[PDB]
């Protein structure tokens, strides 16, 4: 127990906020509420884990320091560094089983747990390694995040698939009712490799993307994934199951194409959803020549009706849908025009941007 370091407040603030992501509410193990601080080679390493996934932030030290390591409560420490005045010099060191944080006339004594008892993830070796812009990964995750399943018994659906095929990187997420898929080129001839990143890991990976001009170094291993963006290294265990094939889920011959304004279509569904069933959220779609009629009913016998002028080429058909699943798609599509590919009343519809096909969404109907 020897480490000491002196860092300026602003140089610790973003890293502390960053590594405190995996850490939530009240944690299962006491050590999982602490951050591993590690002074070495002239750099400070802040680590925050939940067993499953970890986040490491490397901070360059300017003031004299001494190497060593310990873990300190995350929420307290950050609330201390943030509470300090702008431009404060934070001087940190050990005290038997305490950490002494001093800055001006402010002095804090935090209870520490040994560094040796911090879950530094099981040694692993990478298989697929590639680099791509932060904005690319952000789009890929952002456009499919919502379709993941929360606590489905089918563990493999509570996560996002990260599949590399040729020059593209693809993300696909589904819950058994909806599916979202997005694929974008990253200027590299990649091997065919598909891995399932857990739901919580996906969120923390997206949150670490500030949107900057820096590259992102992704390392996919046997049972782990790693992402390097700037001075942050995110690592996460992969979900162990066989993810369903998105290609089999996509409609084979959806011949009835409907085109309409994304916002006008979103507003109609949002208004119809008001008088829909609060639990089941059922709305039925009537597609007529250049017309769409959305009808919603609830147990109180209240009815909403929305008629829209669409660009509809095809036969008249009726289809029931979970308006929340449909609105989720319309909000993910931040575009001007949308295209809907209707197969029939009991088959899925493919909704995608009328301008771009990088992202496609499949929503299964309900029998009304």
């Amino acid at each position: 127990s020897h480490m000491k370091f002196t860092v300026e407040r602003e140089h610790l603030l973003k890293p502390l906020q960053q590594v405190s992501g995996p850490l939530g509410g009240r944690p299962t193990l006491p050590i999982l509420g602490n951050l591993l601080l590690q002074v070495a080679d002239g750099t400070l390493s802040l680590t925050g884990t939940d067993l499953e996934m970890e986040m490491v932030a490397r901070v360059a030290l300017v003031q004299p320091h001494e190497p060593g390591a310990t873990t300190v409560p995350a929420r307290k420490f950050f609330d201390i560094c943030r509470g300090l005045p702008e431009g404060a010099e934070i001087a940190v060191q050990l005290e038997g089983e305490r950490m002494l944080v001093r800055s001006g006339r402010s002095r804090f004594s935090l209870s520490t747990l040994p560094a040796a008892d911090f879950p530094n993830l099981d040694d692993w070796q990478s298989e697929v390694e590639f680099t791509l812009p932060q904005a690319t990964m952000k789009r890929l995750i952002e456009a499919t995040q919502f379709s993941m399943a929360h606590q489905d018994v089918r563990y493999y659906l509570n996560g996002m698939l990260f599949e590399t095929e040729g020059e593209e990187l693809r993300t696909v997420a589904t819950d058994g009712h909806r599916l979202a898929v997005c694929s974008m080129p990253i200027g590299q001839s990649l091997p065919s490799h598909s891995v399932i990143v857990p739901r919580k890991g996906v969120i923390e990976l997206m949150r670490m993307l500030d949107g900057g001009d820096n590259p992102l170094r992704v390392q996919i291993g046997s049972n782990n994934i790693r992402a390097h963006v700037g001075d942050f290294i995110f690592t996460s265990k992969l979900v162990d199951g066989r993810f369903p094939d998105y290609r089999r889920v996509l409609p084979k011959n959806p011949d009835k194409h409907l085109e309409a304004g994304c916002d006008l279509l979103k507003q109609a569904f949002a208004r119809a959803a008001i008088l829909s069933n609060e639990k089941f959220r059922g709305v039925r779609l009537y597609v007529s020549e250049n017309q769409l009629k959305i009808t919603a009913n609830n147990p109180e016998q209240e009815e909403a009706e929305e008629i829209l002028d669409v660009t509809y080429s095809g036969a008249e058909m009726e289809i029931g849908f979970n308006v929340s699943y449909v609105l989720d798609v319309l909000n993910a599509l931040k575009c001007e025009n949308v295209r809907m590919m209707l197969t029939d009343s009991v088959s899925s519809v493919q909704i995608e941007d009328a301008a771009s096909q990088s992202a496609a969404y499949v929503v299964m109907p309900m029998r009304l």
């Binding site: 009712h177 909806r178 369903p244 089941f280 299964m364 109907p365 309900m366």
Partner: peptide
């Protein structure tokens, strides 16, 4: 009701 995609 709701149908499966699969």
């Amino acid at each position: 009701g709701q149908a499966x995609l699969f």
